[PDB]
Amino acid sequence: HYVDWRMWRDVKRRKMAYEYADERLRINSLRKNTILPKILQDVADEEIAALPRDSCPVRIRNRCVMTSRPRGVKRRWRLSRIVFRHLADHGQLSGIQRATW
Amino acid sequence: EEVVIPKKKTWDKVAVLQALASTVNRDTTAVPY
Amino acid sequence: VDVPKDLTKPVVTISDEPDILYKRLSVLVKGHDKAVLDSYEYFAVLAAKELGISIKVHEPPRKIERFTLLQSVHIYKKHRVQYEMRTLYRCLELEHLTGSTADVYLEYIQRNLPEGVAMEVTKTQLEQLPEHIKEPIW
Amino acid sequence: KNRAARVRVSKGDKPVTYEEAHAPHYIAHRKGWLSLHTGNLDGEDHAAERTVEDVFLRKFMWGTFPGCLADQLVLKRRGNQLEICAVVLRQLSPHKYYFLVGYSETLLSYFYKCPVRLHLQTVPSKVVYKYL
Amino acid sequence: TEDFIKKQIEEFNIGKRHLANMMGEDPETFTQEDIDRAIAYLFPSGLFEKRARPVMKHPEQIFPRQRAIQWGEDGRPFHYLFYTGKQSYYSLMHDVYGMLLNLEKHQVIGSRWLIKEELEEMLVEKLSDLDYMQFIRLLEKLLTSQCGAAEEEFVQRFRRSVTLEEPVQYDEQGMAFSKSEGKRKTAKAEAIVYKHGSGRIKVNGIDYQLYFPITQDREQLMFPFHFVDRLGKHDVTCTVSGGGRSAQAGAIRLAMAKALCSFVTEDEVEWMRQAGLLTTDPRVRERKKPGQEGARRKFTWKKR
Amino acid sequence: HIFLEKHLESFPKQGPIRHFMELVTCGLSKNPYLSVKQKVEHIEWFRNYFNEKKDILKESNIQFN
Amino acid sequence: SLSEYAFRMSRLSARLFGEVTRPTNSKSMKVVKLFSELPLAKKKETYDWYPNHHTYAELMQTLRFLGLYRDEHQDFMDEQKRLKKLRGKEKPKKGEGKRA
Amino acid sequence: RPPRRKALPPRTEKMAVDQDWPSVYPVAAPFKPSAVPLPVRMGYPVKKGVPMAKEGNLELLKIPNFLHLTPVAIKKHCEALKDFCTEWPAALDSDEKCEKHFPIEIDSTDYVSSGPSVRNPRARVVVLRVKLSSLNLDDHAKKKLIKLVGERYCKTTDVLTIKTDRCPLRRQNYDYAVYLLTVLYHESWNTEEWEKSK
Amino acid sequence: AYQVHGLLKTGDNWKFIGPDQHRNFYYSKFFDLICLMEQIDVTLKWYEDLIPSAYFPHSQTMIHLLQALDVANRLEVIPKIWKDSK
């Protein structure tokens, strides 16, 4: 029941990334170093490449949590600029006021 | 010159609330809470 | 005439463990409202005075975080709306109070903390040297 | 022309409450916030979760009291408590009001895992601050 | 209506008694200031508009002084100039004219004229700009004439005070000195000028010639003492913080001038004020506005 | 939480693998967000992976247990 | 660079403070800085970025069916759907696209 | 036609001028116009108007009122809670005596926030502070300890500050701080052979 | 009855007053006895203290209170009582 299919894709990507994060961290730690032999590092590169594509954290997009807008999202509130303005201008966000100085 | 350390008073997690509630009587003008 | 004839009281048990000594409690309350912070300061100061606790008050400088958003839903980049979130502070320093008194006062002032006001209490716990440090094991 | 949260004058007869009358630039000047929680303060956290909770609470309360609400809610948060203060018209019989209060309190408490209280203040009619 | 006002007065009295009970004070001696303080404590509000904060004043102040209908049950208006629609203003004009006639029969510094809004509040009646100008002209003609004490009191009802705007200490060794403070942009300085000295200035514990390499800053430091011909006759210890070199020099200059005002004569103090050595400079950096390059520069209007 | 060297007993006493696991244990000790069970699980996974890869490691003349 | 006394004192301090007792370059120090914090995916803000829209929508729909929540928007949608179905706009069965 | 319910007059009318206010408001509760016997008005008044009355006044409902914390109520609460307090040692009159008798100061923070979750990572930080003068050290041990600690020692204040934040719980960080102080002291009093290369 | 009520008020004995029906019956009988056998001033004090905080009176209890007021000849309260009845 998400806002759009893009939000559904983002949710699936986040879930898969959470599932595979421990293994990705372990393999990356095996890779991002110079102590270990090169052959083992190449094997680790192949193994992390063999992981599902959607498990990569870089594919996660910080869409708005109410309109799926992929840009203008304030990370502190996870809302698009339009929705954040709509809520703040109605006084429904604590402590947020028009800035005049 | 010697310093003494007082004993630690201990109480239940609701002791402060009960102590405060002991100071309020029933509001005559008010219907039950 | 309907006053209770007898009063029930909570149980305060004097344990055998020595109480913790606090040099300073730095209750820093943050809020969006100066009047609310002033009322809370008055309440806390009155409570401390009536509980026999030394207390000092000061006001750290406020922090006004500001940010900017595009106004129109489409284009019109030159037009923006600027919002801010003022954070006003009030630091209460309570000196030389035991652990029991500190716990009671903190519970009293925290249960009555107004909505929209956060609290960060810093406790300075006086301690004695462990036995391993009083004299060298060597 | 600015259009955000403003009630544009049409004929001089449409009634508006105190909150509807005031424009966004009057927030913290002539009208307080409708939700008070420590999320948006300096250094504090979980602002997004509190905002989502507030939006859902407003929608749920508006849809649970159909036409009963006479004004916006006030969502106060003290510790893990959650007080929803509402102004309601005197339309329904008090039996329905009490049923809805118990229902909403229990359901929201079980849904947000926090003790939710609901305080209702009844008014004979929607309070009119001015006419537009 | 009047009965409504009476009911509001009774409600206010009861509420005043209840508030005195709530704050644990004597109801008989609970002044309006105590009421305001109690309301502010019990109902805190950070709203900037003071008129928007909670208020429990007397009904004489909360309700507009336009009062209820200006006629009794019989319908006869109370004031004889009611049908003028401006009975307060025209009654005031009639009284002023009578005063002028009596003056004919018989025969500036710390005050200004109240603005039209103030007069409207005084008479709770809407007035026009030309009406206000006519009344001001009549008042000024009254003042210019040989007004007596009663006329002076009458004018003082409309006079508004103009907003026109030093200690000497001894150290542990009996050196008489004066201490002052000054601000300029973001720099803040605190200066100490001793009554007797041989022209030695220590800025942040450092000599000025080594702390202010620029000749302009040293000239700014020289300006106050040179204006009063007291160069080389006073010792100064000053500490400045924030801002740049010129802002610090200006802050120290202002602080030194204010401190030295404690030693020079009153005429010399007035001369220093007229020279601009005592006025805190309000010129501070202007904020950059959104959609613009700077404080005032707009973005380059695109070529068409 | 901190002294996790006792969990490295199933690793070579000296060698590049020991150095890498020393780095890993230092990182885990610096980590306040993981329970002791998860910190042990990371080291156990590393041990199992190195055991499965003992062929390549021994080809590189780096003994693993 | 420092004298062996200072170098060994620093090494002893690192030993006491739970640092790396053996020399290591920054590239390998990336491993320590990786395990010192939670992975980006594991962070609370990442895996729980969105609210559970399934839970919210299903709960509100169930409440509306139970009659304890008046979804005005859904009532408007249903009224428009009924009017359109009277007009003749209805979804066809699956596998039955008009274009062939 | 079914009868229409008539709202009762507010109970503020039945209140007494010399009643006990804390009975009316024992705990923090929203501003109830039917329960506050004060003619308070809030709201920016319209032109030639008055501030809005309390009945239906959402602005007063927004305010976190302190009607449950009147001075009488505060005094009664403190009188009740006096039984829970323990007297501070009168001997420790000043911070000088506190440092003389208690040379280790432990700093910790508790954060209070609005929400269903009370967890806050910043509460796990522990800061141990101790004056080296208050410790029992010689010249060599002090010199070695200073080099060992590095930036943690401020010679101006002669205070060693050990900050522990790597363990999930505050108690674990406190234990780690105590252990770090112990090992630093013991290594300071321990002399190595290679120290001769100074 | 005063001794019984004092026993009820002592400590947490009030929690043993029972369900709503039992509490209403207890307070009704208590107030009827108070109206019957007490001075009208203390009777009115008890009326203020209990109703409506303790319970909601029944028409018979109001009639008994009216009879007590008539015995005391304090008819000036009679209008207020009617408002209370409303």
PDB file of N, CA and C in Angstrom, chain A residues 65-66 75-79 85 87-98 100, chain D residues 4-5 24-25 27-28 33-37 39-41 44 47-49 51 55 58:
ATOM      1  N   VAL A  65       8.813  10.029   2.865  1.00  0.00           N
ATOM      2  CA  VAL A  65       8.032   8.951   3.468  1.00  0.00           C
ATOM      3  C   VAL A  65       6.537   9.137   3.299  1.00  0.00           C
ATOM      4  N   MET A  66       6.102  10.183   2.599  1.00  0.00           N
ATOM      5  CA  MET A  66       4.676  10.398   2.395  1.00  0.00           C
ATOM      6  C   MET A  66       4.283  10.656   0.951  1.00  0.00           C
ATOM      7  N   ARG A  75      16.469  15.252   5.654  1.00  0.00           N
ATOM      8  CA  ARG A  75      16.785  13.973   6.277  1.00  0.00           C
ATOM      9  C   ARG A  75      16.269  13.899   7.708  1.00  0.00           C
ATOM     10  N   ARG A  76      16.235  15.030   8.412  1.00  0.00           N
ATOM     11  CA  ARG A  76      15.789  15.008   9.799  1.00  0.00           C
ATOM     12  C   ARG A  76      14.322  14.631   9.929  1.00  0.00           C
ATOM     13  N   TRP A  77      13.488  15.011   8.963  1.00  0.00           N
ATOM     14  CA  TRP A  77      12.073  14.683   9.000  1.00  0.00           C
ATOM     15  C   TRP A  77      11.647  13.699   7.926  1.00  0.00           C
ATOM     16  N   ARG A  78      12.521  13.369   6.979  1.00  0.00           N
ATOM     17  CA  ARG A  78      12.241  12.393   5.929  1.00  0.00           C
ATOM     18  C   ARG A  78      11.026  12.773   5.098  1.00  0.00           C
ATOM     19  N   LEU A  79      10.727  14.063   5.013  1.00  0.00           N
ATOM     20  CA  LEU A  79       9.588  14.569   4.265  1.00  0.00           C
ATOM     21  C   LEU A  79      10.071  15.453   3.128  1.00  0.00           C
ATOM     22  N   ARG A  85       6.702  21.841   4.199  1.00  0.00           N
ATOM     23  CA  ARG A  85       6.140  23.184   4.242  1.00  0.00           C
ATOM     24  C   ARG A  85       4.666  23.148   4.609  1.00  0.00           C
ATOM     25  N   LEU A  87       3.057  20.986   6.432  1.00  0.00           N
ATOM     26  CA  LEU A  87       2.878  20.702   7.850  1.00  0.00           C
ATOM     27  C   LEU A  87       3.376  21.845   8.725  1.00  0.00           C
ATOM     28  N   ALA A  88       4.494  22.470   8.355  1.00  0.00           N
ATOM     29  CA  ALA A  88       5.069  23.513   9.196  1.00  0.00           C
ATOM     30  C   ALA A  88       4.233  24.782   9.157  1.00  0.00           C
ATOM     31  N   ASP A  89       3.664  25.109   7.995  1.00  0.00           N
ATOM     32  CA  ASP A  89       2.868  26.320   7.879  1.00  0.00           C
ATOM     33  C   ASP A  89       1.533  26.200   8.596  1.00  0.00           C
ATOM     34  N   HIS A  90       1.110  24.985   8.928  1.00  0.00           N
ATOM     35  CA  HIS A  90      -0.102  24.782   9.705  1.00  0.00           C
ATOM     36  C   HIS A  90       0.170  24.640  11.194  1.00  0.00           C
ATOM     37  N   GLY A  91       1.426  24.746  11.616  1.00  0.00           N
ATOM     38  CA  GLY A  91       1.761  24.658  13.020  1.00  0.00           C
ATOM     39  C   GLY A  91       1.822  23.259  13.579  1.00  0.00           C
ATOM     40  N   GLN A  92       1.790  22.239  12.729  1.00  0.00           N
ATOM     41  CA  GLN A  92       1.748  20.857  13.181  1.00  0.00           C
ATOM     42  C   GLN A  92       3.126  20.266  13.433  1.00  0.00           C
ATOM     43  N   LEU A  93       4.192  21.024  13.202  1.00  0.00           N
ATOM     44  CA  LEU A  93       5.546  20.590  13.522  1.00  0.00           C
ATOM     45  C   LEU A  93       6.054  21.425  14.686  1.00  0.00           C
ATOM     46  N   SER A  94       6.472  20.752  15.752  1.00  0.00           N
ATOM     47  CA  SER A  94       6.866  21.444  16.969  1.00  0.00           C
ATOM     48  C   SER A  94       8.084  22.321  16.729  1.00  0.00           C
ATOM     49  N   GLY A  95       8.013  23.561  17.203  1.00  0.00           N
ATOM     50  CA  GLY A  95       9.166  24.430  17.251  1.00  0.00           C
ATOM     51  C   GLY A  95       9.639  24.976  15.926  1.00  0.00           C
ATOM     52  N   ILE A  96       8.971  24.656  14.828  1.00  0.00           N
ATOM     53  CA  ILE A  96       9.369  25.150  13.518  1.00  0.00           C
ATOM     54  C   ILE A  96       8.533  26.374  13.185  1.00  0.00           C
ATOM     55  N   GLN A  97       9.206  27.487  12.911  1.00  0.00           N
ATOM     56  CA  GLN A  97       8.543  28.745  12.621  1.00  0.00           C
ATOM     57  C   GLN A  97       9.260  29.424  11.465  1.00  0.00           C
ATOM     58  N   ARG A  98       8.562  30.359  10.829  1.00  0.00           N
ATOM     59  CA  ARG A  98       9.174  31.140   9.765  1.00  0.00           C
ATOM     60  C   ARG A  98      10.360  31.925  10.308  1.00  0.00           C
ATOM     61  N   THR A 100      12.781  34.910  10.375  1.00  0.00           N
ATOM     62  CA  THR A 100      12.885  36.313   9.994  1.00  0.00           C
ATOM     63  C   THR A 100      13.938  36.960  10.875  1.00  0.00           C
TER      64      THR A 100
ATOM     65  N   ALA D   4      -0.075  29.756   1.243  1.00  0.00           N
ATOM     66  CA  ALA D   4       0.083  28.700   2.231  1.00  0.00           C
ATOM     67  C   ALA D   4      -0.777  28.968   3.457  1.00  0.00           C
ATOM     68  N   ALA D   5      -1.664  28.022   3.769  1.00  0.00           N
ATOM     69  CA  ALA D   5      -2.432  27.993   5.013  1.00  0.00           C
ATOM     70  C   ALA D   5      -3.234  29.269   5.255  1.00  0.00           C
ATOM     71  N   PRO D  24       0.704  31.659   8.163  1.00  0.00           N
ATOM     72  CA  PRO D  24       1.885  30.951   8.685  1.00  0.00           C
ATOM     73  C   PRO D  24       2.928  31.852   9.314  1.00  0.00           C
ATOM     74  N   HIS D  25       3.095  33.077   8.820  1.00  0.00           N
ATOM     75  CA  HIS D  25       4.115  33.934   9.409  1.00  0.00           C
ATOM     76  C   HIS D  25       3.763  34.386  10.815  1.00  0.00           C
ATOM     77  N   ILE D  27       2.981  32.079  13.153  1.00  0.00           N
ATOM     78  CA  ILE D  27       3.349  30.987  14.043  1.00  0.00           C
ATOM     79  C   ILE D  27       4.483  31.442  14.944  1.00  0.00           C
ATOM     80  N   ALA D  28       4.351  31.163  16.239  1.00  0.00           N
ATOM     81  CA  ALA D  28       5.231  31.586  17.324  1.00  0.00           C
ATOM     82  C   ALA D  28       5.131  33.087  17.561  1.00  0.00           C
ATOM     83  N   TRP D  33       2.284  26.243  18.407  1.00  0.00           N
ATOM     84  CA  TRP D  33       2.276  25.020  17.623  1.00  0.00           C
ATOM     85  C   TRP D  33       1.192  24.073  18.117  1.00  0.00           C
ATOM     86  N   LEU D  34       0.618  23.325  17.182  1.00  0.00           N
ATOM     87  CA  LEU D  34      -0.440  22.376  17.490  1.00  0.00           C
ATOM     88  C   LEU D  34       0.092  21.059  18.030  1.00  0.00           C
ATOM     89  N   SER D  35       1.406  20.876  18.055  1.00  0.00           N
ATOM     90  CA  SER D  35       2.012  19.675  18.608  1.00  0.00           C
ATOM     91  C   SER D  35       3.283  20.072  19.335  1.00  0.00           C
ATOM     92  N   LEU D  36       3.440  19.587  20.560  1.00  0.00           N
ATOM     93  CA  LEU D  36       4.586  19.920  21.392  1.00  0.00           C
ATOM     94  C   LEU D  36       5.319  18.640  21.759  1.00  0.00           C
ATOM     95  N   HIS D  37       6.549  18.510  21.279  1.00  0.00           N
ATOM     96  CA  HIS D  37       7.385  17.362  21.587  1.00  0.00           C
ATOM     97  C   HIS D  37       8.836  17.771  21.406  1.00  0.00           C
ATOM     98  N   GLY D  39      11.207  16.589  19.873  1.00  0.00           N
ATOM     99  CA  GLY D  39      11.908  16.056  18.718  1.00  0.00           C
ATOM    100  C   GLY D  39      12.720  17.095  17.973  1.00  0.00           C
ATOM    101  N   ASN D  40      12.173  18.295  17.811  1.00  0.00           N
ATOM    102  CA  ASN D  40      12.791  19.311  16.972  1.00  0.00           C
ATOM    103  C   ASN D  40      13.796  20.177  17.716  1.00  0.00           C
ATOM    104  N   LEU D  41      14.052  19.899  18.988  1.00  0.00           N
ATOM    105  CA  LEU D  41      15.035  20.671  19.727  1.00  0.00           C
ATOM    106  C   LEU D  41      16.445  20.341  19.251  1.00  0.00           C
ATOM    107  N   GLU D  44      18.339  16.676  19.785  1.00  0.00           N
ATOM    108  CA  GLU D  44      17.393  15.597  20.009  1.00  0.00           C
ATOM    109  C   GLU D  44      17.212  14.781  18.731  1.00  0.00           C
ATOM    110  N   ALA D  47      12.838  12.912  15.294  1.00  0.00           N
ATOM    111  CA  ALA D  47      11.869  13.908  14.854  1.00  0.00           C
ATOM    112  C   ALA D  47      10.940  13.342  13.788  1.00  0.00           C
ATOM    113  N   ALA D  48      11.487  12.558  12.857  1.00  0.00           N
ATOM    114  CA  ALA D  48      10.680  12.007  11.773  1.00  0.00           C
ATOM    115  C   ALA D  48       9.609  11.064  12.304  1.00  0.00           C
ATOM    116  N   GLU D  49       9.976  10.212  13.261  1.00  0.00           N
ATOM    117  CA  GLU D  49       9.006   9.287  13.831  1.00  0.00           C
ATOM    118  C   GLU D  49       7.886  10.033  14.537  1.00  0.00           C
ATOM    119  N   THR D  51       6.881  13.072  13.888  1.00  0.00           N
ATOM    120  CA  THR D  51       6.072  13.738  12.872  1.00  0.00           C
ATOM    121  C   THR D  51       5.096  12.770  12.217  1.00  0.00           C
ATOM    122  N   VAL D  55       0.990  13.007  12.352  1.00  0.00           N
ATOM    123  CA  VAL D  55       0.141  13.034  11.163  1.00  0.00           C
ATOM    124  C   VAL D  55      -0.890  11.917  11.226  1.00  0.00           C
ATOM    125  N   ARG D  58      -3.586  12.737  13.827  1.00  0.00           N
ATOM    126  CA  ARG D  58      -4.546  13.728  13.357  1.00  0.00           C
ATOM    127  C   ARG D  58      -5.532  13.109  12.376  1.00  0.00           C
TER     128      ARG D  58
END
